[PDB]
Amino acid sequence: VNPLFEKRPKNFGIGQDIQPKRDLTRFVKWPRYIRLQRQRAILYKRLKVPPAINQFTQ
RNA sequence: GCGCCAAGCGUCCGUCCCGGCGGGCGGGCGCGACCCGCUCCGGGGACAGUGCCAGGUGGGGAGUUUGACCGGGGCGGUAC
């Protein structure tokens, strides 16, 4: 094997290195219509849904 | 001072070559860089705030008024 080859590890600690490109899907500033849809699903899980509307979950 | 655009591993290809495996040439994916959980993070919160009515305050502002007689008017008087 070639002795020139080497491991060059980078530690992603606080400071001392630049962070890699990781998934930011949980911290994206989504457009206002995506926010509207997702919050509307949360509201249906958060509020007291009356039985006549809740019976369609089943 | 320097710090990014991955090293290193582990696999999958070639309609590509040279002796099913090997070597060369060019690529792909995964780990490196853990997984799951519904609101980006934090601070308040059914209060603040907004809409409508009710009470107080309000020369900051608006509009108006501030009699008459009278040896001039005013002051004084009322002989109004």
Side-chain angles (χ1 to χ4, degrees):
Chain A
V1 297
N2 202 314
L4 289 183
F5 302 161
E6 39 207 42
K7 261 174 152 217
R8 312 201 182 41
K10 42 178 66 171
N11 59 337
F12 306 124
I14 271 164
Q16 91 179 306
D17 218 308
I18 274 146
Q19 295 294 325
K21 290 304 193 180
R22 80 177 78 251
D23 222 336
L24 298 185
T25 206
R26 216 193 100 100
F27 316 103
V28 161
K29 197 186 163 143
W30 301 97
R32 288 185 65 98
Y33 83 105
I34 294 169
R35 276 183 271 171
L36 204 40
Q37 284 173 170
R38 303 194 173 148
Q39 262 170 302
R40 193 224 290 130
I42 276 143
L43 269 190
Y44 266 71
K45 282 182 217 103
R46 206 57 92 241
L47 304 179
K48 280 170 161 31
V49 181
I53 307 191
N54 187 65
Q55 93 207 312
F56 295 93
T57 286
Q58 293 185 7

